[PDB]
Amino acid sequence: QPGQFSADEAGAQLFAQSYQSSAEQVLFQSVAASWAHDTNITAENARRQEEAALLSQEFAEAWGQKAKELYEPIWQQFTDPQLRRIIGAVRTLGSANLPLAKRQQYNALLSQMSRIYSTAKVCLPQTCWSLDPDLTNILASSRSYAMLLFAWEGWHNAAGIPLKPLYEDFTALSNEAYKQDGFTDTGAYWRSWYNSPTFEDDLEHLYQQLEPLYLNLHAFVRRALHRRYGDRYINLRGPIPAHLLGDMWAQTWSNIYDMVVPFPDKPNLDVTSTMLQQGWQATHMFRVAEEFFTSLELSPMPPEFWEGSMLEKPADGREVVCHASAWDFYNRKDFRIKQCTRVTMEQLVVVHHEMGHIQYFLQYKDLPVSLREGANPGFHEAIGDVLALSVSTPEHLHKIGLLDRVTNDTESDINYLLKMALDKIAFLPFGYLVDQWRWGVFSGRTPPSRYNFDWWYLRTKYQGICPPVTRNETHFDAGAKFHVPNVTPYIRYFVSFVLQFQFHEALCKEAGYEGPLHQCDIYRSTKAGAKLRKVLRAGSSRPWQEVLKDMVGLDALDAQPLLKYFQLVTQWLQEQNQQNGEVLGWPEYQWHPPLPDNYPE
Ligand SMILES: *[C@@H]1O[C@H](CO)[C@@H](O[C@@H]2O[C@H](CO)[C@@H](O)[C@H](O)[C@H]2NC(C)=O)[C@H](O)[C@H]1NC(C)=O
Ligand SMILES: *[C@@H]1O[C@H](CO[C@@H]2O[C@@H](C)[C@@H](O)[C@@H](O)[C@@H]2O)[C@@H](O)[C@H](O)[C@H]1NC(C)=O
Ligand SMILES: [Ca+2]
Ligand SMILES: [Cl-]
Ligand SMILES: [Zn+2]
C-alpha cells in the first residue's frame, strides 16, 4: 500500500523515492516471472506470469490514486522538470479508471487477442501451417504466385477476421480509460511520449523527404517482379501485390534480394561459413560482441549476464521463445539475453544489436526505475541498429578476422547498400502507417465499419501495394500483424530508423572517420564511445531533443543522414529507373491482380 507524503513539491520528492523504491520489487517480479516462462513455457509458469502482472496493476493503481489524491492539481506548474514527468506518469491510471468489471473486460481482451494471433492456423484441404516458421518461410522462399497467395490470404483470414469484434471492444474500453487521465483518446496518450506539440507534422515532413528513395526502390523492385511474374500479375504503373516481396506484410523485402541483385557476378558477402571453420559457437559470438563495446571503453557484460542468460536453445527439451530479446530486471543486478543463437553472419549482427540493448541498461541502471528507459520509445532500437551498422560492414568483419580480403570495387558497394535498402528503406512506409491507422481508430475517424478500407488506403498510399485478392469489411487485415492484437506501439520503429542514421553520422564523425558513410566502423573508437556513453546513461532523465542535440547537434529528427548514407545506391536506382522509362509511383491506383486460373485448386 502507498505511504503518507505531503502535498507540495518538496514532499513530492519523497513520494517518488518511496514509489521508485517499491517499484523495483514489483518491476523485478514482472520481469522474473516472464523470464521463467519465455525460457520454459509451462502452464504453471504462465499462471505465475499473470499473478506478477496483476500485482503490478495493483501497485500502479494504489500509487497512482495516491499521487492523484495529493498533487493532481499542482504537479503541472512544478519546479523540477524531472519531477514534472515522474509524478505525471504515476497519476496516469489508464485502465484503473475503468469500473472493476470492465478492467477485467479490458485485460481479457488483451489475453484473447494475443492468443488468437499466436494460435491462428492455415489449414489445408486435408494438417495446418502456422505463422512461425511455416507461413513465414513460404512468404520468403516461395516463388509460386498461387502458393504465396495461399499463405497470404490464408493467414490474414485466419488471424484478422476473429480479432475484429475483440478489437472494437478493446478500442472502446481503451479510450474510456485514458480519457479519465485527460486525453482525447489512447492515440493522443501514445503520441504524448515524445513531447512534441507538432509531432505528426514532424513525421510527415520526415517521410516527405524519404519518399523519393522508396518510390525508386519501389519501381526498381517492381520491374524485377515484372520479369519473374509477367504482365498479368505486375502492373508497371500500379501497386505491387502485397505477397510478392518476401515478407508477409512487405515490411522488408530482403528475401527477394536474389531478384534485384545489381551485380550478381560479384560474390555475396557471407562470412557464415568462415565462422564455423574457426570453431565459433554461440558463447564466443557474445564474447566477440562484448569486446566490441570494451573497445569503445564501454561496460563489459557483468558476471550475472553470462550466468543467467540463454545464449543457446536449451538441450533438455524445454519449450522456449527463440526471438532475440534483451531483459532489464530493474534491480541494477540481473541483465540477460534470451536468444536461440545460431552460428551465422546475421546472428552475429543480431548479437551486437541485442547487446546494445544491454549496454544501454548498464549505462543508466543508477537512475530511478522510472528513468531506466530510452530517451524516447524509439531510442533502444536506434542504438541496437546503429551498432549493427558498423558490425555489418566488411571493414569490421575483416578486423575481427572473418573476411581475409576487403574488396574495393563500387559494384560490390552497390550490392551492400541495395541489400540494406531492402531493409531500411522498404520498411519506412510501413513503420509510418501502422500507428496512423490506429490513431484513426482511437480518434474515431475509422469506425469499425471502415477498418479494412482505411487500412488498405494507407497501405496503398505509402507502401504502394495492394491486396492480391479482393477484400471487404468482414476482413480485418490490420489485425493480422502482431503488434495490433498485442497492442504494441509502432511509430517508434519508424523513429529509430531515422534516429540510427543520425546516430551513425555523429558517431562516425566523432570517431574521425572519412569516406563513404556506409563503410564506417566505429570499432575501437574511444571518442565514439564517450558520445554513446553520454546518450546511454541519460535514459529518460532529460528531454530526448536535448540528448539528441548534445550527440548529433540537432534537436529534432532529420532524414538527411539517412539519405546521405544511401546516396550512392539512390543515384544508381534513379539511373536504372530512367533507362527503363519507369513510372515512379502507382498512378493506376484502382488496379488489383487477377486470381490465378482455377484458384485455390
Ligand atoms: C519449468 O517450469 C516448471 C514449472 O511449471 C518447473 O517444474 C518445477 O520445478 C521445480 C524445481 O525443481 C520443482 O520443485 C517443481 O515440482 C516442478 N513442478 C512441476 C509441475 O514439474 C521446471 O523445473 C522448469 N524448468 C527448469 C529447467 O527448471
Ligand atoms: C465479403 O467477402 C466474403 C469472402 O469472399 C471473398 O471476398 C469477396 C469480396 C469476393 O472477392 C469473393 O470472390 C471472395 O472469395 C464473401 O463471402 C462475402 O459475401 C462478402 N460480402 C460481405 C461480407 O458483405
Ligand atoms: Ca523486427
Ligand atoms: Cl512508441
Ligand atoms: Zn532490438
Residue numbers in the entry: 6 to 131, 135 to 609
Paper text:
An open S2_S′‐mutant N‐domain structure (2.80 Å) includes mutated residues in the S2 and S′ subsites that effect ligand binding, but are distal to the binding site.
Analysis of these structures provides important insights into how structural features of the ACE domains are able to accommodate the wide variety of substrates and allow different peptidase activities.
